[PDB]
Amino acid sequence: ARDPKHDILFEPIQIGPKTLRNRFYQVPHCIGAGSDKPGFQSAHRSVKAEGGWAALNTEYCSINPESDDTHRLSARIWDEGDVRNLKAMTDEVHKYGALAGVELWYGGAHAPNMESRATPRGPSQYASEFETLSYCKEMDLSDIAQVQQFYVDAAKRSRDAGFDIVYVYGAHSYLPLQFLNPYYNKRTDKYGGSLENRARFWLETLEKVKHAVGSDCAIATRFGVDTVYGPGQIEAEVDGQKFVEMADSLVDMWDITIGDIAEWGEDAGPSRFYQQGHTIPWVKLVKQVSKKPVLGVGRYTDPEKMIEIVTKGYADIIGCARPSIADPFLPQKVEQGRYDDIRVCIGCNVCISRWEIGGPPMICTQNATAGEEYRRGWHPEKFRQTKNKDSVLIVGAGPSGSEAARVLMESGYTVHLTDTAEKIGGHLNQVAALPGLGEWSYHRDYRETQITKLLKKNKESQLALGQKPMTADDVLQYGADKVIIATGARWNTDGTNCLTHDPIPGADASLPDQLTPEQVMDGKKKIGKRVVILNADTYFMAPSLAEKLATAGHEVTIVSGVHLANYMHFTLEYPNMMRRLHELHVEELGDHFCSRIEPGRMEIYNIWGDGSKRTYRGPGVSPRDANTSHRWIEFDSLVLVTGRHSECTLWNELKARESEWAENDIKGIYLIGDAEAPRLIADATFTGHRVAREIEEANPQIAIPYKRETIAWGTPHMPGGNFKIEYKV
Amino acid sequence: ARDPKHDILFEPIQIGPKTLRNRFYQVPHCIGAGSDKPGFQSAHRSVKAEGGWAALNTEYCSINPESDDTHRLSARIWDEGDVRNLKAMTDEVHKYGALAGVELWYGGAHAPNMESRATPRGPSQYASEFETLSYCKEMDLSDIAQVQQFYVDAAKRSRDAGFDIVYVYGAHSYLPLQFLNPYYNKRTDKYGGSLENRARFWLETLEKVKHAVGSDCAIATRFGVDTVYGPGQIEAEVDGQKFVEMADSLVDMWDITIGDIAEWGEDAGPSRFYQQGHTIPWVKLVKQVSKKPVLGVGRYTDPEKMIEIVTKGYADIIGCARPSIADPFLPQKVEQGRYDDIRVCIGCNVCISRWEIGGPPMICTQNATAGEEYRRGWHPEKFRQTKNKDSVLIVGAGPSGSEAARVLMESGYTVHLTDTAEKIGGHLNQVAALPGLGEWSYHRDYRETQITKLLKKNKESQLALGQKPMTADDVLQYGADKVIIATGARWNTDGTNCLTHDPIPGADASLPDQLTPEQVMDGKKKIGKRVVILNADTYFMAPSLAEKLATAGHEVTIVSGVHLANYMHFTLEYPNMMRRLHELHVEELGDHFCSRIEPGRMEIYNIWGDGSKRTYRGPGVSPRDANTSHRWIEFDSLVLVTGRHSECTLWNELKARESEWAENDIKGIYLIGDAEAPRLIADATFTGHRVAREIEEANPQIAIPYKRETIAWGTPHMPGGNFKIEYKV
Ligand SMILES: *c1c(C)c(C)cc2c1nc1c(=O)[nH]c(=O)nc-1n2C[C@H](O)[C@H](O)[C@H](O)COP(=O)(O)O
Ligand SMILES: *c1c(C)c(C)cc2c1nc1c(=O)[nH]c(=O)nc-1n2C[C@H](O)[C@H](O)[C@H](O)COP(=O)(O)O
Ligand SMILES: Nc1ncnc2c1ncn2[C@@H]1O[C@H](COP(=O)(O)OP(=O)(O)O)[C@@H](O)[C@H]1O
Ligand SMILES: Nc1ncnc2c1ncn2[C@@H]1O[C@H](COP(=O)(O)OP(=O)(O)O)[C@@H](O)[C@H]1O
Ligand code: SF4
Ligand code: SF4
């Protein structure tokens, strides 16, 4: 039964000329579809509509080619061709009884315009702090009028495309906020200086947009009410509440964020630094002055926390981005009282990393169907049922083997899942114990819960933990029709790394003064005072180990041959991670790698130490002057973070005996997850989901084709257009 | 007329079953189109076919989704959709009598598969040294047979698509090279160990592809004959030549490069480091052993250098990528003896920088129609002719103003171009005087030459240099119908920068101990011994000034608030630039910026010195602990490289008197290039090209729409497919 206290989340609420059916609201978020992948855009949003979300929004939607985010992918509403592509989404969302919203965007200099080559315009000329080679033209009064007109023409196309909700977007330090914020706005005319003057651009845009479409569409606005930068950008109790009072009469609904664009991880709070509800102290300030409905995101996954912010009067509506990606059916699950089916977001920001890299589609660590709904036909809650009695043995219960188990049981198969480990979750169990990573637990907590539930409904299925390791003969004599090897990866013990692909002389994790991540996380092997971490990985392991050891009292130096924490730029974790290492006194030596190791010392070299001039010097000889930067540094312990290898011994043994499978009635054995190749957790989860989805295909080791959303030559994007080459001569 | 010694370049040569009409060959190169923008792909290659190139190749062309380069854009030949898209290019290239070629690609772990999410396969499992989070599965024998079959199926699709030339691609350390090269290949079976074994994968692939399509298509191979890394990878006189001998009977034509993928600026050599012909010492080693036609790229633009390598017997064919982008008509121009019309590539690698960023279309510093042929209808050598006698005044002869003059004169307009400078070229004249950048001067040399010749045939046009600066009154009284303002930008003199968008206290380049780039390049202002460069720019200025200053004997420290030379990662200059700074003893302080300057000293701070934990602390205060890393450093001279600002005073004065334009018979005044917003040189050039092409449009200040190559919802990419959402249930 639904807890009756949760009934309030299912009450409707008026927003201008529209009604939201409940309090679950998907705020605008990127997915890597834009107006470019209309199947993905429409499936991803309409699965959530079917899942019960009251309103579904596009990501940021450019109003004109001079706000082109290429190389990143935004939605666009430039012309009739975009109207058609985006209407595929509004039509589909409407079929499930939800509203659709579009977030009208203009970036100023933050949009680098790499496709359009156009010049962005802004309140003053500046080079973007985020796109540092991108500059804008300072607007004159006619520029201001013409960009306001872009907004009006876009709002009109938006109504043509079937949208119910139209935003003017002034969060993440985009144009309306640029004019509001003296960090950007240095004008001394009537659009700069006092708050009334600084607000003028956004207020006139709202008035013009509302005048164009507002009796048909709700006019929303998204506002970074505090830049979380201190004085000198926007402060909630200085300009923020006061802007709200100025704009309140024009806005049908407030959508509130904090932070800027360069560090928008302050908005999309990674769980490493921020808990559910972290934005409350700023967001709550808006309902203190607004007489309109208000939401403000804060990684809300828990209906207990949701009813708290509503009954205490801090927000009227529950806005979510990530939680809707991890679980498009979150609302229906709360409505039906299926709390234990809720697939809770871990705030890892892998979904965001995709968009930040610029171009790739979204993926999600929890939800292997995000991005897959359209092109592979994978609905998160509906699985093809087996028509046979086949059984599957799965060796290994980390993200990949556990997801395979969950999906195969959902599809009706008999599944035996086994692991030496005491509990489900494989390498994630030690990872989630790293400083800050505690919520990454939820990935294996969800799978433990679901697998336990699923066992009750197939009676032949089985979960066996803390078992002896499976051997090739155990597998061969197990009795399963098909077998999945999901045995994971381990960190290298011998210095092998992506720069040289070879061991490092003297590297050996069995020695008393060297350790792998696993040995560090296990916490039995002694670690001395001075610790060097030798790093050839660009994600979280080395910085997380550095933080762990430094908080535990060690003097830590990281020697990195690749850009330290580079992938954390994309998950937005990097700025706070670097501040954390700095507070903790961790020393960083970038651009160095290690050519050999001995007890208590290691030799390092600057990676740019070879001569700059290449000549042909013949065979057997380097074409550059020799690198003479080598020097010795000391340590008491050396932690090797140099890369990973697949644990695929068992697979190798079974394959060498493939001639024996048929006589043992084994029809197939497949290799997934880290054991095939070291993957992101999201991608290991994906491989388990995919093999389970395709377990009946000719070769389940290899994905079948997905639908591609690429133009077909001979079909013009513009309706009635001419697709042929035409020179202007 | 053509020099008779160039006649050799126009002799045909047989390659297997096909005939090249001349010795001008466009090797495979990225353009940002692949099979996804079939308009762009077909227009870009077919203009060159019209321009006399004997063969035009697609870029690297994936044979299967488990070699997907997303976020970077490759061609693809995975299915019938791609066959239709690429056939637009083969049909268009054939219309002009050239051969069309495709480059069959499989990247191993170098392809990060961010769209497909499939697992790449390789000779041994490694993490790519270029994509450092991307790992492959080690190939067993069936894997090898399967990937070989992918090449075969792609080659059959290629013949369907109408290609004449099919490559097995084994350069830039892609898969055939990975099996060849013990840096990657650690196998101990019959595909590893000896040369014969290491070559077996590439040899079998060639035999299979030749078998499938060889009667119909020339089989070419691209080979990184030396990795330029010394022993430990491929060396030309060790494995290189011996491999050519083993494969010679299978290959119709050799296409030779040097270098790997992580540092492929050794192949696409930047003029900063490499002259025309820089590859000859390695390339000529192939004809020492091969009996087949051979080419090897080397930034060839001069026909004198071209006949040298053919008459000496070092190559049979002139392969080009960049020269063909700068001038699609280079071969016709040589054929007709129009040497002074040749637009010579400057080796800036801005074209490549787009590809490297991942996703955007190619652009070109010399050729402002690259990427624009299809979507704007801009042919590089055909100009719509004016039908009126309108005159245009152009103030400033830098890359934008001189491009605008050139195009307007080619279009039949009367133009008067004026500048205070003694020579055409604007800010490029000092830029090209920086260490290594002398070849960048070709951009202005081309325009100086072209403008001089256009004046001889456009008799009412005029060039005036060494002029007094134009004032607003001079412009208003000048007598032109239209005016273009192209007055450029300057480096900031008060510390204004992209981090704070404000001046720095104490910054002022009028002080004797502080200098701008222009003051350094001018050479008059004295510079002291200890130099600090303060940098907030990510491209070439700060590194290039550091080189110049350290080579002149100064002790140089670079304090950089942004990632130093970040943009040079994309131009492939970064690795030799860092080696150059290291060998000159230039010190770098990354992650710091500057809070105030005084005579001989400046206060710097660590950019990550703020506390890592954000909390609500109310207005007037930072949400984090204070940054306490501030410290002073001394200098004798401080070079300010903090950002640029438009020089738009003349513009602002004319706009302030817009009410007088009609009295003075001025129909419009437009603002282009760096004076509208500081741009890359390629983009400043584009703005002048654009306004010239669009001088008759309603508002030439703003680009008209271009044709968009994005899918139309309702049309499936696969012929006969179903575009509608369908779930697998
Ligand atoms: C993209 C990505 C994938 C994320 C998760 C957030 C996001 C994305 N793109 C956005 C955009 O197009 N416009 C916009 O206004 N906001 C965008 N976001 C931020 C998102 O809307 C939320 O503000 C944050 O994710 C925090 O909310 P929550 O995920 O904790 O609920
Ligand atoms: C992309 C880019 C834009 C550049 C100019 C070169 C290039 C690109 N992509 C390539 C790819 O798809 N396959 C391939 O084999 N080579 C590719 N290239 C390298 C190019 O082919 C030449 O080897 C170099 O540019 C050197 O030749 P040149 O430009 O000096 O004539
Ligand atoms: N022979 C084996 N028998 C049983 N379990 C195994 C065996 N080999 C490895 N495992 C288990 O396989 C799991 C792989 O999990 P993990 O490393 O998280 O991989 P992934 O991320 O691919 O899911 C580990 O929990 C490990 O205990
Ligand atoms: N008032 C003026 N009258 C004539 N020329 C000017 C005036 N102001 C600036 N210039 C010239 O304009 C040119 C601008 O060139 P440049 O800086 O290279 O801009 P861009 O990169 O946009 O082409 C310089 O050569 C400069 O001398
Ligand atoms: S990738 Fe991590 S963050 Fe993003 S929605 Fe999924 S799960 Fe939450
Ligand atoms: S961008 Fe530069 S290197 Fe590339 S083709 Fe054009 S002029 Fe040559």
Side-chain angles (χ1 to χ4, degrees), chain B residues 379-386 388 390-421 424-439:
Chain B
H379 192 286
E381 305 284 333
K382 297 172 196 192
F383 297 94
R384 185 168 283 172
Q385 289 307 299
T386 176
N388 60 50
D390 284 20
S391 64
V392 184
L393 163 67
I394 306 166
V395 184
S400 67
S402 66
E403 185 72 3
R406 183 181 72 89
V407 180
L408 284 168
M409 289 192 286
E410 288 287 3
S411 307
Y413 289 92
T414 291
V415 358
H416 276 220
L417 173 62
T418 193
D419 203 317
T420 68
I424 281 164
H427 81 287
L428 182 58
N429 297 312
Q430 292 184 308
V431 160
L434 296 167
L437 299 190
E439 299 195 24

Side-chain angles (χ1 to χ4, degrees), chain A residues 398-400 426-428 430-431 485-493 517-518 521 541 643-649 671-680 684, chain B residues 125 135:
Chain A
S400 66
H427 82 287
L428 185 52
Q430 293 176 309
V431 168
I485 307 289
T487 44
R490 289 235 114 197
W491 288 84
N492 298 341
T493 55
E518 297 101 331
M521 294 181 287
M541 190 54 77
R644 292 189 292 163
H645 59 279
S646 287
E647 170 49 70
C648 59
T649 290
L671 183 69
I672 68 174
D674 299 326
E676 195 190 28
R679 294 322 285 274
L680 289 172
Chain B
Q125 166 161 96
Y135 291 77

